[PDB]
Design a protein around this nucleic acid. Structure first.
Lengths: 93, 83, 108, 98, 91, 104, 97, 78
DNA sequence: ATCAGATTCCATTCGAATCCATTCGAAAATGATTACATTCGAATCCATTCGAAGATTCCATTTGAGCCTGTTCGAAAATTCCATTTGAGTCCAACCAATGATTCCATTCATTTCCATTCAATGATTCCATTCGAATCCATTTGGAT
DNA sequence: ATCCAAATGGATTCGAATGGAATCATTGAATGGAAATGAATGGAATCATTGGTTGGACTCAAATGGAATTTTCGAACAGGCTCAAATGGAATCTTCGAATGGATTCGAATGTAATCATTTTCGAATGGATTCGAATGGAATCTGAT
């Protein structure tokens, strides 16, 4: 009887920003809802994107246009950053 | 069981009063308390129907919190924490 | 044979690139998934997670408490303008509201 | 003897509740109201405790935000008091009615 | 190349109403309508399958979809003609 | 030989079956679903077209123009709900004037 | 010199425009406004004629519904006249601000 | 060009919406809100055009934009 | 209320013109037909899990009294903003020419999909340790009356 | 400007439920060697879009004149705030009863994967049309005034 969660990753990122601070189980729950909600918005918009342009594959280009569409303003810009960072760093080795 | 009757009266005048406070209302007209119960009833119906519809498609007799979650997300009220 | 490590490390992420790729596959979003998409996405999710967790940790240490509870999370979202837009239609369980009192209702 | 004039425990508890997260509607009445609304839609139903709690959080959030929009309607009409006329204007602009 | 619902909007138009023909911009509106509703139904159907971990969309999902999307009496007439059309198909 | 005639529909069951496959909705599409859907589409089309044609010659015009579609949609209460968040091009609005603003 | 008072041939033009579907905003001024707003986003852009038309349909439709909600706000305050304050209450309740 | 949206055109737009009397400050306030609206559409629309690697905004781009915003428009092909 | 004069619909024909509907040779799908791959209708068996109830404590809910103040009614003053003329201009609108830009192929390399086969990352369980949800109590307000 | 009484924080305190690590499984990344796609890469025609130019026509910006609606201002009717007593029934605890979920299997009936060979829908012009846009003649309603 075992299910998935984002708790450990939310947790790690918690110890990067605030190493002194904890997270309550209901607060962690709200965070899981957050990851899953945003995952769905991003992926749905990417899927619409590929479909409107008649392509069969979601690529980092789709995820990015998605992010530009969903996310407001400065949040969007900083997200495009950490993203394209992670992707180039991945493509090298 | 027992027969369920007139439970919209379990939403009291005080509870409606607190709900008006946390919403930043100084003074409440007397005709509000029933009108509140009007709209609450509507709201709670439209969710519960959808919730129960999910529960029926799953071919279950027990309404899960996820059925309420899908229900509200359908309504355009997205709720966090019960996933 | 060769010893693996994660794709999460090759992009330097705490978020699970592999898992995100799996869900992209099993969610019927497209027939195929470029290898760069789970990376960019796990980046956006880890970034947004991180921004939220900072603003919440601040509301938590302004209220003199060492643990993040949903109240803080609600404070974090509803004060930051862009998060407030991103989550405009979201409701946080146990969230509370922001203290606000219209000017006109204040003693004269 | 005492006590405070019209308006004073109004502002006092607005501050009181706005500072908390507690559910304002009493739990067990709300539970019945859900079981009644649900049963008279479909019968022989069961509810996970969590599922009711979810419904109550959603309902209270919905209602509080609506009271906000209402109070702005009163203040727009120059009054300090929320009237049914306000609630119906709030929900009409909200796209819940005409 | 490439597709429209126009021929079908027209057939159905004069089967219900021998009265009238259809203008191009009104035909556009009818097309955008068919397409929109198609998308709503099928999306709700896919979500339904997913929530329940089923890998295939059946008439059952389209049905629960319609009950969710369509209001009230419109919904019940839609569920009706849906099950009718399906049953006559099995013959 | 059609699936649409074998179901007694004008709407193209076959096309709907293709769209269900090529729309990324699920890995498989049951044989009954495109029929039920093409059905609900034909009905919704039909109810609309009926109200639209009646609206059309109640202004005594031999054609349904988007104006007629808007009158039909916005007068029927349930369709008005279904389409509340849609805007119909060339639609106009319904003639309505709040009373408080009428003469005398 | 027998001619009209405050407001009633206002009502008269109300029912006649309400009865038509005509695009009320002058078209090419609107097009210029679309092109200038767009270039500030990206330059060397061209517009399908249908795209400008679509944006005009959307723009006037939006404005129509907002004037409905505005007028309901004005009447709600016991006044008969739409004020900036009404547009703002309409758009704050609508969740646009 | 925001002043190309005239006082008459705003008035007619208020008429079809059934408004009796207009404040003087409205036309500018009107002109404000339109602008925001007209921006938010085009940005999204323009985003669609740039993903397509096209330099011409198709009416389908505006349709997708409006559908994203939650103002769904019928008759232009989607 | 009628009188008793301008406008303004508001309809009943009128003549053109901008389109719908019909007919017409091809891409582009749809339908069949074996032949797989698999999804999940059928079916016991285990266990969360809810459902109901019973009990006592006291937390709020209810009900009614007095009264302060905001809602509304009214009347007056102030002005913003309706209507129309005149006159000036910028919107239609018609092809009309040229050229960027989409868009359909058609190769080749690069990428993404499979499908087993092990190797870590992960996801319940106990198993302890520690924020903090309840209490009291002083001090700092903070109101409302002299 | 000042005294009273709660009330407002918020400092300090002690049970405890709610964390946050450690330990075993095991589900699932990750690897890696072929098997399909897909995305440009140049490569070319046809489009739609811009672009001016140059007539007429509404359509638009000001300016005046006063008719009404908005704000103001003041009374007055009164509805909702504020208070305290009366006990109800919510909250809380703990317990069991068995209906219903929900993991594990084991199978026909269903949907998929090709792959052809018919059938269809799209296209794109061409021959009836339905409506746009004038023209008045009369209600139709609006209006200053008997």
């Amino acid at each position: 009887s075992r299910k998935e969660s984002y708790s450990i990753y939310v947790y790690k990122v918690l110890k990067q920003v605030h190493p002194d601070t904890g997270i309550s189980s209901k607060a962690m729950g709200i965070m899981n809802s957050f990851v899953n909600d945003i995952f769905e918005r991003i992926a749905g918009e990417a899927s619409r994107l590929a479909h409107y342009n008649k392509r069969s594959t979601i690529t980092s280009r789709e995820i990015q246009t998605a992010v530009r569409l969903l996310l407001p303003g400065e949040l969007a810009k900083h997200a495009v950053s950490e993203g394209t960072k992670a992707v180039t760093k991945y493509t090298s080795a | 069981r027992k027969v369920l009757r007139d439970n919209i009266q379990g939403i009291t005048k005080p509870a409606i009063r607190r709900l008006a406070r946390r919403g930043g209302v100084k003074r409440i007209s007397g005709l509000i308390y029933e009108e509140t119960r009007g709209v609450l009833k509507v709201f709670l119906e439209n969710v519960i129907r959808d919730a129960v519809t999910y529960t029926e498609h799953a071919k279950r007799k027990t309404v899960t919190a996820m059925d309420v979650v899908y229900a509200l997300k359908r309504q355009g009220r997205t709720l966090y924490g019960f996933g | 044979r060769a010893k693996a490590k994660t794709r999460s490390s090759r992009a330097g992420l705490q978020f699970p690139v592999g898992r995100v790729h799996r869900l992209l596959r099993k969610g019927n979003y497209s027939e195929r998934v470029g290898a760069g998409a789970p990376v960019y996405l796990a980046a956006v999710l880890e970034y947004l997670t991180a921004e939220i967790l900072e603003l919440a940790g601040n509301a938590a240490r302004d209220n003199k408490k060492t643990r993040i509870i949903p109240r803080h999370l609600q404070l974090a979202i509803r004060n930051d303008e862009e998060l407030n837009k991103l989550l405009g239609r979201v409701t946080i369980a146990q969230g509370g509201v922001l203290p606000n009192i219209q000017a006109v209702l204040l003693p004269k | 003897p005492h006590r405070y004039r019209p308006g004073t425990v109004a502002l006092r508890e607005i501050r009181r509740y706005q500072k908390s997260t507690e559910l304002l509607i009493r739990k067990l009445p709300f539970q019945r109201l859900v079981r009644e609304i649900a049963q008279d839609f479909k019968t022989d139903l069961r509810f996970q405790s969590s599922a009711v709690m979810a419904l109550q959080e959603a309902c209270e959030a919905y209602l509080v935000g609506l009271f906000e929009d209402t109070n702005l309607c009163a203040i727009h009409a120059k009054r300090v008091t929320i009237m049914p006329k306000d609630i119906q204007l709030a929900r009409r602009i909200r796209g819940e009615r005409a």
